[PDB]
Amino acid sequence: TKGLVLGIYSKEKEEDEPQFTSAGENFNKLVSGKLREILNISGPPLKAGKTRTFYGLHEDFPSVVVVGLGKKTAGIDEQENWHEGKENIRAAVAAGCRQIQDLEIPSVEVDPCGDAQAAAEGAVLGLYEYDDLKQKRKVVVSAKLHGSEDQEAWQRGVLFASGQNLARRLMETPANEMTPTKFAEIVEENLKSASIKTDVFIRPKSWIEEQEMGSFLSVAKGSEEPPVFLEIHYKGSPNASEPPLVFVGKGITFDSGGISIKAAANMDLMRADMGGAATICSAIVSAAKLDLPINIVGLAPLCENMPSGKANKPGDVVRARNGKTIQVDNTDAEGRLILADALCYAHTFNPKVIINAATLTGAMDIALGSGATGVFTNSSWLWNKLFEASIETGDRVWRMPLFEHYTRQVIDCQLADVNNIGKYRSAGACTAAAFLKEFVTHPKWAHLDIAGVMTNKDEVPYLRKGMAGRPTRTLIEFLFRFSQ
Amino acid sequence: TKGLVLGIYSKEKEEDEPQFTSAGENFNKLVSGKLREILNISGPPLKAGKTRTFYGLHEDFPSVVVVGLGKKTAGIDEQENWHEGKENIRAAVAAGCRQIQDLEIPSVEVDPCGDAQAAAEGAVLGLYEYDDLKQKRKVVVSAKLHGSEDQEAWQRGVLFASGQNLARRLMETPANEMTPTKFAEIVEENLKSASIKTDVFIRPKSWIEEQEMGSFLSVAKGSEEPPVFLEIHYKGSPNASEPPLVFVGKGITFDSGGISIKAAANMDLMRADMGGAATICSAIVSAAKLDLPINIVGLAPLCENMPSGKANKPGDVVRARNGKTIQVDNTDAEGRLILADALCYAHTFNPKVIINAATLTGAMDIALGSGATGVFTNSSWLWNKLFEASIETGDRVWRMPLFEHYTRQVIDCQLADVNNIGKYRSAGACTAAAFLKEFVTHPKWAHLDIAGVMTNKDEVPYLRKGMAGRPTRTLIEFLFRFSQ
Ligand SMILES: [Zn+2]
Ligand SMILES: [Zn+2]
Ligand SMILES: [Zn+2]
Ligand SMILES: [Zn+2]
Ligand SMILES: [Zn+2]
Ligand SMILES: [Zn+2]
């Protein structure tokens, strides 16, 4: 019927016993001390992220899962660059919800754990699973707030987590279903449901040609799947003329590498090479849901990178919208090609800031793995804003260098103005970033290389194995704070 | 006979002609305007780092090389994290000196260029070449300050550059000559020449065994070359009891990878796998030369990593000095093994700070290349001190993360307390750093992964192709400022 998730903290030195949250304390009282009694009988105390289940304590809650929240006053961890208490809550609540789901319980009430937004994030991110294409599926669990005192915060958590889950769905869906057109249609419907103060333009190939986006076009042509340039507007500012914030995302729905073909092992994960587009578009959907008082534009060039008799050939020179020529030495360095055109187009909006996201390089994965998203930016103010937002969400960012040292290695080009792969194999994420900078003149630009945080195995406790949708929540938080 | 290097700046908008430095202006006057006249006749102005040679202008200087210094007031570049003017001077002066050397001139006087230390660094780092083992050698050039007004600063530059050149020599020398014993003897003689307030102990294998350094010993045994543990003391503090600063360096004189053998291509560069030891030992020699008022201890475990019938075998478990067990899954991840024992020993000195350097991972090279040394530290105060020092020297540092996220991947171990390679291939530099942290309890520790800055092709203009000796000057600067 109905399950209940309650939290308990680690015992502090002067306490005689570990303390329940307010809800746990109230429930124990409701059952005349039976919860504390049974917890004591069960043995060792619950530590952070651990769970234990007690049956039959109340007729309304046949299964009660108690979860360890760790130290009650855990705040910002100076060494980890995140709010520890929030992370403990997300992990603990996710673990509790997965136990409720294993017991095949369709609905669960969740203890706010002193921070309803974090509790909601743990439950909603934790229960998520992409199973539309399977016969065998786990029970669908409906999680709601236990109590009625922390509603806005709980709902805020549901909203943030839902945005990330939308990104996860888009990334996880196989490329034959999640084509450029399909991705555009799903984003279009989600944005329109979020707010009527939106406009969506799924720009066709003819428009792309009119816009002289030769770099983007060169990538798309190898495949039979039609390319599209998704342009979305959210008019949240009270002043329609207020300069917008522009987000740009790499939308390669499937990357085979092209003529510079990839190895077979785990190439299926490349269905998520559109993660950059997924995260920035989902962030905008969420911003619209929150009705943030700001104008935002989202740009996402979308296409496949396939080998064929029409595909990009190593050595080919293409002309970007801005007139710059690019020597395509490696057709698998295609994300930067489509981004060159989208970044150029972004300047036409005279934006306040330009932020792009892309599952750009394997080098980024070798550099930081799934620990944090690499951020390249010409603005310390912007770096700081993204960094502060990440401490709150727990979806960490780490700064990477934008030095001429790297630029020199990409403009040293045999046939053109810029080469699409560096002179050497070193610092691949840095030279890719340098390539992108040659198409940016804006003073507040940030490039997020999310290749290393594309998937999750078990690193983030509250995300099941699969595409991660990171760092969608950090982007939403940045926008929220920016709007305030 | 004697050559002369003079600088000229880029012309500023309201100037009628580009301005010479004070020395260039004085020389032009000495030759009745002949320098300006000929420079004008030669054509286009000289830009940063470019040079032009004029003959017969003065009987004392048959060859005068004018070098472009760029913008006179170039200060700290916010985007590049270095003092630009100093970098322009080092590059320009090095280029000028190389031209003088090509003309086979044995002595040259160098314009201080508004910053004698930077000019001296450009000349001394710029002319350096390891050619002891060649029949054919370029002319030995003796560079001295032009004038007598900037002596202390010029000499400071010579000292800093000489320290780096010592590191370069140690790194460049072939491993059959630069053995553990030889490296120790060369460092010993250099430290003793620098100051009488020093003690050097080239600890033998019996001492290593007595110290129960099983991890270090396991690496050394595969080779026939005797291992040594170099321990150096510089007693510069007025108070002999003042806690020392401790530097630790990885001294693998040659790394074949061991049983987990390396590929053949460019394996010769592994003669520089002792770069960590070279840089920290050279920094200490320089600190002693400067007679900094501080106590410093240098620790450098030295040995070869070779395959044989006695070598480390994948899966073997070894016991570190601190009692922790380590599963040696990959024998090529040997630097962290010898460092575990040296870092443990470092705590016995009750130091103020512990800084280690190591050409540790190929991942670091993939991460940042030769743009900057990766720094992992549990102290933002220490990060800041190293960062500020690097702005001054131009030998840049960049912070990398020390997160439990990475620790989890190395303590998840089948047979022991810690595994010498991570669970996954991602973030190799980060998991290596996490491994090292398991052997550190000190509150002010920094690990410098210098694998990416081991060599120079043409990235640093003032360093000829070969082993770089980076970031020796940043370490010297840190110590200088610390002492003040
Ligand atoms: Zn997909
Ligand atoms: Zn690709
Ligand atoms: Zn791609
Ligand atoms: Zn050597
Ligand atoms: Zn090795
Ligand atoms: Zn090594």
Side-chain angles (χ1 to χ4, degrees), chain A residues 365 368 398-399 406 426 458, chain B residues 365 368 398-399 406 426:
Chain A
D365 184 89
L368 302 182
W398 191 269
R399 203 181 186 171
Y406 303 115
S426 309
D458 67 345
Chain B
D365 184 89
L368 302 182
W398 191 269
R399 203 181 186 171
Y406 303 115
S426 309

Side-chain angles (χ1 to χ4, degrees), chain A residues 4 55 71 100 105 148 220 308 311 324 452 469 472 476 484:
Chain A
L4 179 60
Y55 304 106
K71 294 300 186 289
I100 286 295
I105 298 170
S148 57
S308 73
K324 276 189 179 173
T472 306
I476 300 164
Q484 293 195 116

